[PDB]
A paper describes a structure:
Although most signal via cyclic oligoadenylate, an alternative class of signalling molecule SAM-AMP, formed by conjugating ATP and S-adenosylmethionine, was described recently. SAM-AMP activates a trans-membrane effector of the CorA magnesium transporter family to provide anti-phage defence. NrN is replaced by a SAM-AMP lyase in some CorA-associated type III CRISPR systems, including that from Clostridium botulinum. SAM-AMP lyase exhibits a typical trimeric PII-like protein architecture characterized by a triangular core formed by the four-stranded antiparallel β-sheet of each subunit.
Purified WT SAM-AMP lyase was crystallized, X-ray data were collected to 1.70 Å resolution, and the structure was solved using molecular replacement. The asymmetric unit contains six copies of SAM-AMP lyase, with two trimeric complexes. Each monomer possesses a signature ferredoxin fold (β1-α1-β2-β3-α2-β4), featuring a β-sheet on one side and two α-helices on the other. The β2 and β4 strands from each of the three subunits interact in a ‘head-to-tail’ orientation, contributing to most of the trimeric interface. The T-loop connecting β2 and β3, which plays a key role in interactions with target proteins in canonical PII proteins, is shorter (10–12 residues in SAM-AMP lyase/SAM lyase compared to >20 residues in homologues) and presumably less flexible in SAM-AMP lyase/SAM lyase (given the loops are fully modelled in the lyases, but missing in the homologues, despite similar data resolution). Comparison of the apo SAM-AMP lyase and in complex with MTA-AMP reveals almost identical structures (root mean square deviation (RMSD) of 0.3 Å over 123 Cα atoms), consistent with the slight conformational change observed in the homologous SAM-lyase (Svi3-3) upon SAM binding. This suggests the proteins essentially have a pre-formed binding site for ligands. Given the proximity of the T-loop to the binding site of MTA-AMP, it is perhaps surprising that there is no significant movement of this upon binding. However, the side chain of W64, which could only be modelled in some monomers suggesting that it is highly flexible, appears to move through 90° from a position that would clash with SAM-AMP to a conformation promoting the π-stacking interaction with the adenine base of the AMP. This residue may serve as a gatekeeper to the binding site, locking the SAM-AMP substrate in position for catalysis.
Numbering used by the authors:
A (entry chain F): -5 to 14, 18 to 124
B (entry chain A), C (entry chain C): 2 to 124
The structure:
């Protein structure tokens, strides 16, 4: 079959959020966060034509119990995405958009704190 | 000294493999990776191990994403200087395996990223 | 504006701890990390938080990997400039904790990687 491959230097983001909502499992909290992210990314895309996709992974975050962490860690989700040159024209505008969406997710999940990191990456995209 | 890690995201193609949970799809992808990595190692003598995580990938429903995201697996590995002599050959091998996984999982698109990393290996 | 993140991959040593699910092995590793980070913080005033993910690691069955991969946990953390003053001291502390985890989990081998990152922290 025919095939295409693109390679370029770009950025990926990674966000960590709590899961706060009456979910009963990591499978259920994955679906919860997935639905919320899908809605906020869609709203942004309608304004700017920039769609910020994310891969979401179940996790627990371990920190000092004296700052409120439960024993053995707090239930969290990790969201990761990339600026794919096929869909993204301007890396600075994309980065600004990711930061905006991170703050909105923090609000929707009613979180006190939230992290968002940018990491340099070499993206190969196969079709 | 620096080296490289790779990360791939793949779908699990329920339409074709008919897994019923994230536990089952994790095992499916784990077994497929094990087989393709072994086949490649027999050809090139380069064995590419991967750490695999369950996930869901959220994109625009108008491009076919299910509500709340598509079931996916994330595969991540590294060029460990204890086992790898030539980084360029390793990178070429990872790209080969990414394409093979895309084929085996019958995926329309697939991503493979390389990230610079400083590996400490304790034995 | 740059800092460092770490990522560790560890086995869960079913031979010794006998966990029955990925949920149970996540809590096991979580509790061990919490205790070793606390003990270190009391000595050095450096607290190393981690986000822990369930996973499997796929390698050659001829080196002892189970079919479809071995149950593992991935631990990832960052040097947050709001809490961390000296990156070299932090990195040394992470290495110490990685070795201690290797000991507590009775692992033959363990990896710890450092990756450059740009951290935004929202309060």
């Amino acid at each position: 079959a025919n095939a295409m491959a693109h390679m370029g230097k770009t950025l990926r983001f990674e966000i960590v959020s709590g899961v706060n909502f009456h979910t009963n499992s990591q499978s259920e909290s994955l679906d919860l966060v997935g639905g919320i992210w899908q809605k906020i990314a869609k709203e942004e895309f309608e304004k700017s034509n920039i769609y910020v996709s994310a891969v979401i992974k179940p996790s627990k975050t371990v920190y000092n119990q004296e700052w409120g962490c439960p024993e053995n860690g707090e239930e969290t989700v990790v969201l990761t995405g990339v600026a794919n040159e096929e869909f993204v024209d301007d890396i600075e505008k994309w980065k600004d958009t990711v930061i905006k969406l991170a703050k909105e997710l923090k609000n929707q999940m009613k979180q006190s704190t939230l992290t968002c990191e940018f990491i340099e990456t070499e993206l190969h995209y196969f079709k």
